[PDB]
């Protein structure tokens, strides 16, 4: 779900030359969440 949201938001900003500050902040929140999710999945599978 998060990936779909990020893809749509990237499409929204695709034509625009430069992302503005609020868009940067929103990307940053999304990527921090995705980072935590990746780490959690990695930790599930690790050991293995």
């Amino acid at each position: 779900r998060l990936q779909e949201s990020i893809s749509d938001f990237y499409w929204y900003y695709s034509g625009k030359d430069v992302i503005e500050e609020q868009g940067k902040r929103n990307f940053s929140k999304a990527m921090s969440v995705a980072k935590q999710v990746f780490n959690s999945l990695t930790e599930y599978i690790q050991g293995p």
Binding site: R1, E4, D8, W11, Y12, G15
Partner: protein, 221 residues
Amino acid sequence: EVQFLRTDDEVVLQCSATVLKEQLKLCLAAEGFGNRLCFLEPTSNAQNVPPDLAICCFTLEQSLSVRALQEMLANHRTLLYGHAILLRHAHSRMYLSCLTTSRSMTDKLAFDVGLQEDATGEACWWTMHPASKQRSEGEKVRVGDDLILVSVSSERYLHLSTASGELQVDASFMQTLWNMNPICSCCEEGYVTGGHVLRLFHGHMDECLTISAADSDDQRR
């Protein structure tokens, strides 16, 4: 291994109707040249009467997210529920579209569905949605799945109209379930496949199977 519809595949759209307490499967069809408007060709009898599939067949050129479609309009992939698809007639090289014109006096809001020469515009695009609750958006479309098709341009469903005695195809706010049935996915070079026009040559290309020319006495039988 559950077959997943993919772009560049060729499909036929089927709908089911109950007439005389007897189920009937009907395929969307368009001649293109001469008549742009779509109609329904029954396929259930099949063995007693062969249907004309060539016009019925469509190919999935593109599947896109709504946002990507918006950007593209401003300027082999698996299908996902909620994406927008572009469908090309195999015979006429035309695009399926929601026409502005309406013929149905029964439903004033409804619009006719027909072929369009150019891919430009929202009309040619359609969005897929699950017919059933268990299916959810973002899920890969599966062969045999019942689907709901909504026009981007008109926000109306591809619909089967039984109000008139004759069965008709229209874009309406009422929804009709549709099944996307594959005909071909990928063909190896050479390697004859069904549904293709070809010539039959008796030997080393000298002579071929044929029927009598026009206005012949045999009546071309």
